[PDB]
Amino acid sequence: NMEARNVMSGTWGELWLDGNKVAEVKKFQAKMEFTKEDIIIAGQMGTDTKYMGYKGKGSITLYHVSSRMHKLIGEKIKRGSEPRFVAISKLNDPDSYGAERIAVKNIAFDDLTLADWEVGVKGEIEAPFTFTEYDFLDII
């Protein structure tokens, strides 16, 4: 049995990035993709697969209220170091069964936006990334 009230609304999400709460978050994605290899055998018609490896992808979207990403990155990329980050996302809808809390680790951002504005339009920032591992803290 399912109720309509049990579907989680995205307005109840929360994000922590490097231990600091991000109140201007708009959306958050994180997904793990598996790589497959096709197996074909002479004399048989059907085709099968085996797993090879996996990779992580995601992105963040923020309202533009400050220069958070520039301070987070700084000169670390320019100086040749390799910075990595930890993100924690929580989804707690009062009408659902419970909360869902995930930690995304070893994050590497894909680009940095310095300026993107237009007359008569409100500002937003988009930040894709890749990661390698995750942990579950609360399971619904």
Binding site: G80, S81, E82, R84, N106, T132
Partner: protein, 136 residues
Amino acid sequence: MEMWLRQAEDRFRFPVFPSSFSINGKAAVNSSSILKIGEIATFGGVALKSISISSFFPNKDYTFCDYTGFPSPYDCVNKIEKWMKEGFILRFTITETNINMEVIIEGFSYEERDGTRDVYFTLDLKEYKRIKIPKV
């Protein structure tokens, strides 16, 4: 799995494990042609195995590195180059496989190709067999 090259008690462990490794083996077959029957063949002996490795020596402590405490890239390059120069007989082993044998270094090439100061290399090894001289 781990990769080691060792000369007596002096041991070196590779900091970044390569993407793949392959072992090549062959055997010799002698062919003759006999009138009105055709070609025939006989066994002639086995050849020495060969193995090639491609990876890089990192200039900083990466997340994917095998361990911490490895030397600088050019320190590794100098050590392996000295081993190749003197013609030492070394022991090459990959853990969790059947690869554990005495080898000799045939080639060593290294390069830099980006802004990270990492050194990419290619190492060619050949199996070594000692000859037994009988006495009486």
